[PDB]
Amino acid sequence: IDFAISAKPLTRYMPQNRHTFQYRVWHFVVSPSFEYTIMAMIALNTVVLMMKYYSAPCTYELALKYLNIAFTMVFSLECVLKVIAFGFLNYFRDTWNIFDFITVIGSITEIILTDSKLVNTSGFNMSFLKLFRAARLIKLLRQGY
């Protein structure tokens, strides 16, 4: 029970400036119209991962392609909305953000390499990049405790 040896610090992410940007976005990030509106985008994104099936009409496969993009942008827009509102160094210190950073930087590059302008050759395969967009399911584990 004597963990008073640690756990001294608290939040300490206050910008405390009423600043032009930093205390304009930080107010947006906190005070849920964002905490529940990103807990709803990781709720529909765990439904477009279950909606893949075998022999889809090729316009079902296309609706999922443009939905996956429409969640990657939202999750990437989240990513550059917390480097701004918290600062770069205070962002990469929760370990639940450098997880959400990796999944988005790994799913941004899944959209590109499976698109044109770059070829899938040189004996290296983009099949393992599907794990990065199927790892957004673990973002639901965060609201366990």
Ligand SMILES: CC(C)CCC[C@@H](C)[C@H]1CC[C@H]2[C@@H]3CC=C4C[C@@H](OC(=O)CCC(=O)O)CC[C@]4(C)[C@H]3CC[C@]12C
């Ligand atoms: C968290 C959950 C409760 C929300 C929604 C998830 C499931 C209820 C949905 C998502 C994807 C669906 C699947 C998507 C595709 C198919 C193929 C489909 O096969 C056909 O094309 C034949 C008949 C048909 O068109 O449904 C049969 C239903 C099934 C398995 C669906 C069953 C219901 C699933 C699992």
Ligand SMILES: CC(C)CCC[C@@H](C)[C@H]1CC[C@H]2[C@@H]3CC=C4C[C@@H](OC(=O)CCC(=O)O)CC[C@]4(C)[C@H]3CC[C@]12C
């Ligand atoms: C974004 C989240 C909430 C996913 C839930 C959306 C689904 C309710 C939508 C998205 C893609 C839709 C599908 C896209 C393509 C088709 C093929 C379509 O078959 C056709 O050939 C008709 C017209 C066409 O798409 O060319 C019939 C409807 C269906 C199954 C749609 C049914 C409704 C779906 C599953």
